[PDB]
Design a protein around this ligand. Structure first.
Ligand code: NA
Ligand code: NA
Length: 128
């Protein structure tokens, strides 16, 4: 399925080249511009654990998730991954725990040392 495919066929987008964040572009976005550090970014996403369970979805809440890029307001894999996306793009990210919630995990559903899969859509980005 999709998590196996990004694990085996994804692009390492880390600056360390440590396979910690793998990406596949699923829907090509618009133009060539990617967001800037500090921009307000608006995303839709769904997250799955390596056991197949869905742990989160913004679609199910009928509102996007909004954060300031490159500020550590989200897991490192998202600050790195969303910074590579074009407006309108949909991608898959496969995130090792060192770029996600590490040994602590995140209650109630993310265990310690969890590799996470996300589908992310970059809806928009704007500077303040
Ligand atoms: Na595929
Ligand atoms: Na891109």
């Amino acid at each position: 399925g999709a998590p196996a495919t990004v694990t085996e066929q994804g692009e390492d987008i880390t600056s360390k080249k440590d396979r910690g964040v793998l990406k596949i572009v699923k829907r090509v976005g618009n133009g060539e511009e990617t967001p800037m550090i500090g921009d307000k970014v608006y995303v839709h996403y769904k997250g799955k654990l390596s056991n197949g369970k869905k742990f989160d979805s913004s679609h199910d809440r009928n509102e996007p998730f909004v954060f300031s890029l490159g500020k550590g307001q989200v897991i490192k894999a998202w600050d790195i991954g969303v910074a590579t996306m074009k407006k309108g793009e949909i991608c898959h990210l496969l995130c090792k725990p060192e770029y996600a919630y590490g040994s602590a995990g995140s209650l109630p559903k993310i265990p310690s040392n969890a590799t996470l899969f996300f589908e992310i859509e970059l809806l928009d980005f704007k500077g303040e």
